[PDB]
Amino acid sequence: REVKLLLLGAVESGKSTIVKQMKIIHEAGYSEEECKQYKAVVYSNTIQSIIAIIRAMGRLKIDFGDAARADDARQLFVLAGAAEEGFMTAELAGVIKRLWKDSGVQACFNRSREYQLNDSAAYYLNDLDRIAQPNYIPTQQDVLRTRVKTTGIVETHFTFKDLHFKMFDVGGQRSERKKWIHCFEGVTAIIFCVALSDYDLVLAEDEEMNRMHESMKLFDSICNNKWFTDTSIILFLNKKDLFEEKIKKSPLTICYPEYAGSNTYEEAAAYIQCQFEDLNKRKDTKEIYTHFTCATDTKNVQFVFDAVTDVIIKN
Ligand SMILES: Nc1nc2c(ncn2[C@@H]2O[C@H](COP(=O)(O)OP(=O)(O)O)[C@@H](O)[C@H]2O)c(=O)[nH]1
């Protein structure tokens, strides 16, 4: 039997990451010379992250801890504002390192909810020593942590439990098209991704438009959509890892001011699940299957997928 799966969700919820995890787990996986192809993405990802923080400092009126840093800030734009592709040298690596390490820079970094910063900003920056190497070759995790906007509809075929799957990633924009989406009316299952860590984030261009709400609004559209009653709805409350760390310093009340529980991972996460599951009108007939995930964690996606597949077979 062939199972069709449609990944839906806002931008940066983890869709391509899950697609990548399917290749790694169910297919070949990323080869040494396949990883080399992201050597660049990794550099580009890293350069942009640091530039964003440095650029935010001004916007937020934050000062370097050391003034000799301003000379490094200037040097970053010279090396970056010269190259056209993501590269990496030893001088560049020094600049970035000294900046990363700076107190004023760390201060701006801890107020990242105020600006737009790649989630993996910190990961690449804390391993610059390693990714900066002359022969550096990205690892699977480095590839799973990259950030590439998928414009087209991506798909994958893998086999699992004598079942052949066909995953479709349409992206955020197309998840929205109320009409278009109709072309997918018979889908076996739909995996809807939500980024838990977005609760205290604003949607850039909109800057006052909370993202979790935007996702909540989209979940509502699909969930209660005529074309998917016969379609299973799986909810991946993704980024549980960054949520665990954020929740202990950024209250849920920022997202849900009516929240009265306490701000612990267990209570707050449960509050988010409920808010989503409750958007389901046909709650009588239709059941939503929720899962807390970490798309970059291959062990998690695997355990979790085994679970998803066990449900699809059952119904
Ligand atoms: N820490 C962390 N990073 C994640 C997780 N899921 C995805 N990412 C990162 O999220 C950013 C965007 O994810 P992506 O899968 O490109 O999302 P898409 O826009 O929905 O396809 C990338 O940097 C991903 O590596 C997660 O659970 N935890």
- Given 21, 46, 72, 147, the catalytic residue: 147
Is 17 known to be catalytic?
A: yes
Is 173 known to be catalytic?
A: yes
Q: Whose CA is nearest to atom 7 of ligand 1?
A: 14
Residues 43 and 72 placed together within one structural domain of the fold: yes
Residues 244 and 98 placed together within one structural domain of the fold: no
Distance CA 291, CA 192 (A): 10
Residue holding tokens 């998690």?
300
- Given 17, 21, 231, 296, the catalytic residue: 17
Distance CA 155, CA 171 (A): 11
**Ligand 1 centre distance from Cα of residue 40 (Å):** 18
Backbone angles phi, psi at 87, to 5 degrees: -120, -170
Residues 126 and 44 placed together within one structural domain of the fold: yes
For 49, half-sphere exposure in the C-beta direction (CA atoms, 13 angstrom radius) is: 26
Domain span at residue 89 reads 31-149
Most ligand 1 atoms within 8 A of CB, residue of 291, 292, 296 to mutate: 296
In the chain the first and final C-alpha atoms are separated, in Å, by: 13
Residues 154 and 143 placed together within one structural domain of the fold: no
Residue 194 β-bridge partners: 237
**Annotated binding-site residue? 61:** no
* Technique used to solve these coordinates: X-ray
Residues 78 and 163 placed together within one structural domain of the fold: no
List, chain by chain if needed, residues with CB within 6 Å of any ligand 1 atom. 9, 11-17, 118-120, 144-145, 147, 150, 238-239, 241-242, 294-296
Residues 18 and 79 placed together within one structural domain of the fold: no
Distance CA 111, CA 108 (A): 5
Q: Which resolution in angstroms does this entry have? A: 2.8
- Given 169, 198, 200, 231, the catalytic residue: 169
Residues 89 and 194 placed together within one structural domain of the fold: no
Query: What is the CATH number for 222?
Result: 3.40.50.300
Q: Whose CA is nearest to atom 2 of ligand 1?
A: 239
**Ligand 1 centre distance from Cα of residue 147 (Å):** 7
Q: What torsion do the CA atoms of 103, 106, 110, 114 make, to the nearest 10 degrees?
A: 100
Is 169 known to be catalytic?
A: yes
Residue 154 β-bridge partners: 169
Listed residues 88, 115, 149: the one ending a domain: 149
Distance CA 242, CA 20 (A): 20
Distance CA 13, CA 235 (A): 12
Residue 165 β-bridge partners: 3, 158
83 is written with which tokens?
């190259």
As a three-state string, the secondary structure of the chain is CEEEEEEEECCCCCHHHHHHHHHHHHCCCCCHHHHHHHHHHHHHHHHHHHHHHHHHHHHCCCCCCCHHHHHHHHHHHHHHCCCCCCCCCHHHHHHHHHHHCCHHHHHHHCCHHHCCCCCCHHHHHHCHHHHCCCCCCCCHHHHHCCCCCCCCCEEEEEECCCCEEEEEECCHHHHHCCCHHHHHCCCCEEEEEEEHHHHHCECHHHCCCEHHHHHHHHHHHHHCCHHHCCCEEEEEEECHHHHHHHHCCCCHHHCCCCCCCCCCHHHHHHHHHHHHHCCCCCCCCCCEEEEECCCCCHHHHHHHHHHHHHHHHHC
Listed residues 149, 169, 192: the one ending a domain: 149
Residues 139 and 169 placed together within one structural domain of the fold: no
**Ligand 1 centre distance from Cα of residue 285 (Å):** 32
For 273, half-sphere exposure in the C-beta direction (CA atoms, 13 angstrom radius) is: 18
Q: Sort residue 127 into left (φ over 0), alpha (ψ -120 to 50) or beta.
A: alpha
Residues 104 and 230 placed together within one structural domain of the fold: no
The radius of gyration of the chain's CA atoms, rounded to the nearest angstrom, is 21
Query: What is the CATH number for 40?
Result: 1.10.400.10
Atom of ligand 1 nearest to the CA of 193: 20
Please say whether the beta carbons of 197 and 243 come within 8 A. Answer: yes
Q: Is the alpha carbon torsion for 287, 290, 295, 297 positive or negative?
A: negative
**Annotated binding-site residue? 21:** no
**Ligand 1 centre distance from Cα of residue 12 (Å):** 6
Q: Indicate the number of domains in the chain.
A: 2
Distance CA 292, CA 304 (A): 9
| Beta pairing class for 2-9 and 164-169 | parallel
Q: Is the alpha carbon torsion for 82, 87, 90, 93 positive or negative?
A: positive
Distance between alpha carbon 41 and the CA centroid of its chain, in Å?
16
Distance CA 8, CA 72 (A): 41
Q: Whose CA is nearest to atom 11 of ligand 1?
A: 12
Residues 1 and 96 placed together within one structural domain of the fold: no
Residues 145 and 96 placed together within one structural domain of the fold: yes
Residues 177 and 200 placed together within one structural domain of the fold: yes
**Annotated binding-site residue? 17:** yes
Listed residues 86, 117, 149: the one ending a domain: 149
**Annotated binding-site residue? 104:** no
Most ligand 1 atoms within 8 A of CB, residue of 15, 16, 17 to mutate: 17
